[PDB]
């Protein structure tokens, strides 16, 4: 079918700045010294300083993640005496 | 690979500096204000937040090991609770297992539907008793 | 503040280290004597009620 006139109603907006893209200076002027302002020191440890506090945080408070992980370690501990006796239930059933 | 490698020599590292010596008049520092020392300060300090996160890899690297072992372990000991009990059957310990078997359980249960049927011997004698 | 800051959570890196190697003293322990305790714990008495 003539479907699908999505890759195609783009193409008077993509030839658009492919004119006005290149064929600028006869119609612009290069004057008026725009001023630049771009981000000194203070700026750089922003960027630094919410990132190592994001795991300054999440490496302060690893120690209750690890003690969950070395309370399930006796947990387990404790419930093996429980898992010995149900294995050793289980094969004498065809054993007797 | 856990080695509390140790305390004091980690500390001075935080608060140590070459100063080597870097030419004033050179385009390495052109206006040479405070600034460069702040970035090459800050940035430089940042390499132990990376050290200590890569020992926090080291941790759960380490336990998940641990547990992996664990793991095998048990997928091991069902062979070992088998040939366990062989040595359990082979033995004489199997005079355990008839003999709490057999005994107690077949005297209750002889004795207790003799106690039973007697009793209701005993009640019938009662009964005719009662009707007669 | 920010070098006091990460000298501090240092110290709690040396602690979970100083916490970590007693438990893995104890844990490998359990691992690498664990046929032993194996046979020594099942033999216990309470099979008779089983």
Same mark, same amino acid.
């Given at each position: 079918? !003539?479907?699908?006139? *999505?890759? %195609?109603? $783009?193409?008077?907006?993509?030839?658009? &700045?492919?004119?006005?893209?290149? +064929?600028?200076?006869?119609?612009?002027?290069?004057?008026?010294?725009?001023?630049? !302002?771009?981000?000194? *020191?203070? %700026?750089? $440890?922003?960027?630094?300083?919410?990132? &190592?506090?994001?795991?300054?945080? +999440?490496?302060?408070?690893?120690?209750?993640?690890?003690?969950?992980?070395?309370? !399930?370690?006796?947990?387990?501990?404790?419930?093996?005496?429980?898992?010995?006796?149900?294995?050793?239930?289980?094969?004498?059933?065809?054993?007797? | 690979?856990?080695?509390?490698?140790?305390?004091?020599?980690?500390?001075?590292?935080?608060?140590?500096?070459?100063?080597?010596?870097?030419?004033?008049?050179?385009?390495?520092?052109?206006?040479?204000?405070?600034?460069?020392?702040?970035?090459?300060?800050?940035?430089?300090?940042?390499?132990?937040?990376?050290?200590?996160?890569?020992?926090?890899?080291?941790?759960?690297?380490?336990?998940?090991?641990?547990?992996?072992?664990?793991?095998?372990?048990?997928?091991?000991?069902?062979?070992?609770?088998?040939?366990?009990?062989?040595?359990?059957?082979?033995?004489?310990?199997?005079?355990?297992?008839?003999?709490?078997?057999?005994?107690?359980?077949?005297?209750?249960?002889?004795?207790?539907?003799?106690?039973?049927?007697?009793?209701?011997?005993?009640?019938?004698?009662?009964?005719?008793?009662?009707?007669?």
């Amino acid at each position: 079918e !003539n479907d699908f006139k *999505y890759f %195609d109603d $783009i193409r008077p907006f993509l030839d658009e &700045i492919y004119k006005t893209r290149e +064929r600028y200076t006869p119609f612009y002027d290069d004057r008026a010294d725009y001023n630049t !302002n771009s981000k000194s *020191y203070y %700026d750089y $440890i922003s960027r630094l300083s919410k990132l &190592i506090e994001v795991l300054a945080r +999440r490496i302060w408070d690893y120690d209750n993640e690890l003690k969950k992980r070395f309370k !399930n370690w006796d947990d387990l501990m404790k419930a093996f005496p429980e898992q010995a006796k149900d294995l050793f239930r289980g094969w004498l059933n065809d054993g007797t | 690979f856990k080695y509390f490698d140790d305390i004091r020599p980690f500390l001075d590292e935080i608060y140590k500096t070459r100063e080597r010596y870097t030419p004033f008049y050179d385009d390495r520092a052109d206006y040479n204000t405070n600034s460069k020392s702040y970035y090459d300060y800050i940035s430089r300090l940042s390499k132990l937040i990376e050290v200590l996160a890569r020992r926090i890899w080291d941790y759960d690297n380490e336990l998940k090991k641990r547990f992996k072992n664990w793991d095998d372990l048990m997928k091991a000991f069902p062979e070992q609770a088998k040939d366990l009990f062989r040595g359990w059957l082979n033995d004489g310990t199997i005079d355990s297992i008839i003999h709490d078997e057999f005994k107690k359980y077949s005297a209750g249960l002889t004795s207790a539907f003799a106690l039973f049927k007697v009793t209701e011997m005993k009640q019938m004698n009662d009964f005719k008793s009662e009707v007669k």
